[PDB]
Design a protein around this motif. Structure first.
Motif, short mmCIF file in Angstrom:
data_model
loop_
_atom_site.label_atom_id
_atom_site.label_comp_id
_atom_site.label_asym_id
_atom_site.label_seq_id
_atom_site.Cartn_x
_atom_site.Cartn_y
_atom_site.Cartn_z
N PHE A 316 0.82 -1.21 0.00
CA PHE A 316 0.00 0.00 0.00
C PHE A 316 0.86 1.26 0.00
CE2 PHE A 316 -3.08 -3.02 1.92
CZ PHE A 316 -4.15 -2.81 1.05
N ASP A 317 0.42 2.27 -0.75
CA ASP A 317 1.13 3.54 -0.82
C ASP A 317 0.58 4.49 0.24
OD1 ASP A 317 2.41 5.97 -1.46
OD2 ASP A 317 1.08 6.35 -3.17
N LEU A 318 1.27 4.53 1.38
CA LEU A 318 0.87 5.39 2.49
C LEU A 318 1.41 6.79 2.31
CD1 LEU A 318 -0.65 4.53 5.20
CD2 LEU A 318 -0.02 2.74 3.58
N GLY A 319 0.72 7.76 2.89
CA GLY A 319 1.15 9.14 2.79
C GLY A 319 2.25 9.39 3.81
N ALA A 320 2.83 10.59 3.78
CA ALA A 320 3.90 10.96 4.70
C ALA A 320 3.40 11.21 6.13
CB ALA A 320 4.62 12.20 4.18
N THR A 321 2.68 10.24 6.68
CA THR A 321 2.12 10.33 8.03
C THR A 321 3.12 10.13 9.17
OG1 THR A 321 0.52 9.36 9.58
CG2 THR A 321 1.47 7.90 7.91
N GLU A 322 2.85 10.80 10.28
CA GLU A 322 3.68 10.72 11.49
C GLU A 322 2.72 10.64 12.68
OE1 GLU A 322 7.11 13.84 11.29
OE2 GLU A 322 5.56 14.52 9.87
N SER A 323 1.57 10.02 12.47
CA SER A 323 0.54 9.91 13.50
C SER A 323 -0.34 8.67 13.28
CB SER A 323 -0.34 11.16 13.43
OG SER A 323 -1.12 11.16 12.25
N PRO A 324 -1.37 8.48 14.12
CA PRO A 324 -2.29 7.34 14.00
C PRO A 324 -3.22 7.44 12.79
CG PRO A 324 -2.11 8.00 16.25
CD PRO A 324 -1.53 9.11 15.44
#
Lengths: 392, 392
Positions: A316-324
Motif C-alpha cells: 500500500f502507498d501510504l502518505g507521509a504520516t507521522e501519526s495514528p
C-alpha cells in the motif's frame, strides 16, 4: 420562495448518483457506542474511521462522571459563558487545561470548530494579516474569513514560502500564523521549529490547532509544542475535546491578557451557549486518565506502528504520516468511493477523501487507529482491504 | 512572538476597569444547576437572566434520558455527522423535529451558532445576495460573512427598506432573507407576514432563526412560522436546543432537496463533531414534553404577563417586547453595569446590554422569565430592582 434557490442546488447531483449506484456511505447510522466495533443495520463493523484515538468514549469512569454531572447540574446551562452559562466546573477545566499545555489561562468553546473561530476572528484587524498553511482545517479558514484582516495562504509545510510571504508585509502591521499541529488529511506534523524561528524573526503571533495532537504526541499527550519543546514560542495553543478527550467542545490556551481579550471579544464564545455539564465532567475525567494512565498513549502507538508496517508490507502507498492517521492513496474518485462502500459491505469502516476536497490523483481512504484496537482487528481489516483493492 | 499582538489588545481596558471598580459581573461561576435560583459563592441568587424558558434543564426525566443515552452510546461520537458521527438517535431527532415544524427534512449541528453558519455560508454564491435584519443574531452576521455573496443589511423590522433594497438587485441573481423570529435584545417579533409577501414577490428565499421562538410561540411551541401560520412561505426554519429545549446543539429544517444539499456542503456540519448522545436524548425528551404537556408554555406566559404588568406599574420603561424577554431600559453604560452588580449583590441575576453592542442611550438590562418561576420570586426580584434603580 424557492425559485432561484432551486437553481443554486440543482447542479449538485453527486449524492444523487452515489445513492442510485448503491455506493453512498456518508452519514451511516451507527446504533451503538463509538468503539473499535460498531453496530450498523444490526451487523458488526470494524471501526477504523474514528477520531477517538484513545478509545475513551466507552470508559465506564468517564461515562459515570458525565452522568454525575447531569445529576448535579442538569442538562444544560441555557446561556453563553459571557452571561449565565459559566459553572465552577468550566473554570476548573480551564485551569486544568492551562496547566496541561503549560500556559497561563484558557477559555472553552462549545465545539472545537468555534475554538478556531474565536481567536482568528478578533485578534488580527483591518491592516493586519493571517498566515495559513494551505491544508489548515476548514474551521481555521472560516475563522480567518471572519476577521477583517488580509488572509494569506502559504504552501503546505513550505517554510520558504512562509518567510517569503511574510517578508513582503509592512513592518507596522500585526501578523498571526495559524497551523494544524498534526494535519488530518495526510497525518503529517507541522514543521514547528522552523515556523517559530520565522515567526519570532518577523514578530508574528503563532497559533497551533492541536485537535489531532492532544493525547497523541507531546509529553503525556500535551501536544505539538510539547512535542518539539517549543511551548515558549507558541502564543496560542488550541485544542478540541471531540477526539482523544472523547467529548465535545474545545479551548484556546495562552497568556492571561490575551485569553481575557478573547473571552470578551470572540463572538463564538460571547454569543453561543456553554458546553453541557456532562461534556465538561467528561473532558475533565478523560484528561485525568490520559495523564495518569500512560498505557493508552502507549497502546495507541503500538497499534499505529504495527498497522503502518503491516500496510507497507502489503504494498500500500501510504502518505507521509507521522501519526495514528494512515492515509492509503487510491488516486481515483470513483475507485475511492467503490473501495469505501465495498469495505463497508465487508464489515470494515474507513473514511474517503475525494474531490472537491482534493484533486482526483490525491484521493485516498483514511485508516485510523484507536488505543483499544487489537492486532486481530487490524489484521482482519487489512486482510479485507487487500481483497477489496484487488477487486477494484 | 507577542510584540505586535500585545499592541492589538493593549487598547482593551474595559474589563480591567470594571474589575478594579468592583463592578465586574461577566462569567459568574454558578455552582449549581441552571434553575430559578442558582448558587454563586455559596449564596442563593434569583435567576432572571436565563434562556431556559420552560425551566426544563432540571426535569428528572430529561436528565434520566441523557444518563441512559450515555450508558448506551458513550460520551461522544468522535467524528462529524458526515463520516463516523451519525447515530440512529440523531436521525430520529431530525425526523421528529421535521414533523414538529412541518417540514420535509432536517439536519442537526453541534450548536445553534453553527446551525446558522451552515445555510448562510453555502446557499448563496458569488453573484447572489443575503438580506439581513440589522439586529440579527451575531451567528447570522458571521454565517453570511462566510458566504461568497454580497451581504446587505436592512432597517430593523423595516419592510419599506427591505423592499427598497431588494428592488435594486438584478433579476438574474438569487436572494436569501434571514431574520431572527423573536429578537433577543428587545424581545420583539419579526413582521413575518409582510417580509414573506415581499420575499415571494421578488422570489427570495426566507430563513427564520427561531432560537427564542421554539417552546415559546407557535402551536405547541412550533415557532414563528407556526405563530403566523406562514409555514408554507418560510423556506428554512432554523432552531436551537440550548434554550427551551434545555440542551446544546441546533438544526435547520426545510425541503428534502435543500437539506440534502446542506448536509453535504455546509462546512459547520461536515467538519465538526456531532452532538453528544446525552444532548440528543436530552433534546428528544424535552421536545416530547413541550408538546405533550401544555402546562409549561402556559406557565411561561402567565409569568411573562404578570411580570410585564408588575414592571409597567412600577414605572419601568420596557421595550417593545412580545415575548418572555423583558428589556428594562437604563440609557447609561455606567449605570447599567452598576445596576447589574448591585442586583447581583442583592441576590438577583440579570443580563446587561451595553456599548459597543448598542449605543449608550439604548443600554438596558434583560429580565427573562422561566415557566418554573413563581409569583413570589418575580415579586422579590422586581422589589429589589426598584430599590436599586432608586439608589442609582
Amino acid at each position: 420562495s424557492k425559485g432561484k434557490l432551486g437553481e443554486k442546488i440543482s447542479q449538485f447531483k453527486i449524492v444523487e448518483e452515489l445513492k442510485a449506484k448503491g455506493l453512498y456511505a456518508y452519514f451511516r447510522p451507527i446504533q451503538s457506542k463509538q468503539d473499535t466495533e460498531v453496530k450498523i443495520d444490526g451487523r458488526r463493523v470494524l471501526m477504523f474511521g474514528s477520531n477517538s484515538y484513545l478509545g475513551l468514549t466507552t470508559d465506564t469512569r468517564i461515562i459515570k462522571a458525565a452522568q454525575d454531572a447531569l445529576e448535579k447540574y442538569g442538562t444544560g446551562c441555557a446561556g453563553s459563558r459571557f452571561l449565565n452559562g459559566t459553572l465552577d466546573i468550566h473554570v476548573e477545566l480551564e485551569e486544568k487545561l492551562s496547566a496541561y499545555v503549560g500556559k497561563e489561562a484558557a477559555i472553552l468553546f462549545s465545539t472545537g470548530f468555534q475554538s478556531n473561530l474565536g481567536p482568528l476572528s478578533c485578534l488580527m484587524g483591518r491592516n493586519d494579516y493571517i498566515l495559513l498553511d494551505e491544508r489548515d482545517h476548514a474551521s481555521i479558514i472560516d475563522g480567518s474569513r471572519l476577521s477583517f484582516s488580509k488572509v494569506i495562504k502559504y504552501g503546505h509545510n513550505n517554510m520558504e514560502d512562509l518567510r517569503a510571504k511574510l517578508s513582503r508585509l509592512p513592518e507596522d502591521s500585526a501578523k498571526l500564523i495559524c497551523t494544524d499541529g498534526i494535519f488530518s488529511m495526510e497525518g503529517d506534523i507541522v514543521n514547528l521549529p522552523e515556523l517559530t524561528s520565522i515567526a519570532n524573526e518577523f514578530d508574528a503571533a503563532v497559533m497551533v490547532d492541536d485537535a489531532h495532537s492532544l493525547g497523541v504526541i507531546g509529553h503525556k499527550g500535551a501536544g505539538t509544542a510539547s512535542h518539539f519543546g517549543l511551548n515558549d514560542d507558541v502564543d496560542l495553543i488550541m485544542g478540541t475535546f471531540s477526539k482523544s478527550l472523547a467529548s465535545l467542545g474545545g479551548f484556546v490556551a495562552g497568556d492571561a491578557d490575551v485569553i481575557d481579550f478573547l473571552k470578551h471579544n470572540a463572538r463564538s464564545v460571547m454569543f453561543s451557549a456553554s458546553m453541557t455539564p456532562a461534556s465538561v465532567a467528561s473532558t475533565l475525567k478523560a484528561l485525568e486518565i490520559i495523564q495518569n494512565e500512560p498505557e493508552h498513549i502507549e497502546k495507541l502507538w503500538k497499534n499505529t506502528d504495527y498497522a503502518k508496517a503491516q500496510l507497507l508490507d502489503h504494498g500500500f502507498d501510504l502518505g507521509a504520516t507521522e501519526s495514528p492517521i494512515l492515509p492509503i492513496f487510491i488516486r481515483s474518485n470513483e475507485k475511492t468511493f467503490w473501495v469505501t462502500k465495498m469495505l463497508q459491505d465487508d464489515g470494515v469502516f474507513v473514511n474517503p477523501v475525494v474531490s472537491p476536497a482534493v484533486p482526483a490523483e490525491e484521493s485516498l481512504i483514511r485508516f485510523s487507529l484507536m488505543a483499544t484496537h487489537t492486532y486481530d482487528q487490524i489484521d482482519e481489516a487489512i486482510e479485507k482491504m487487500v481483497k477489496v483493492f484487488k477487486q477494484a
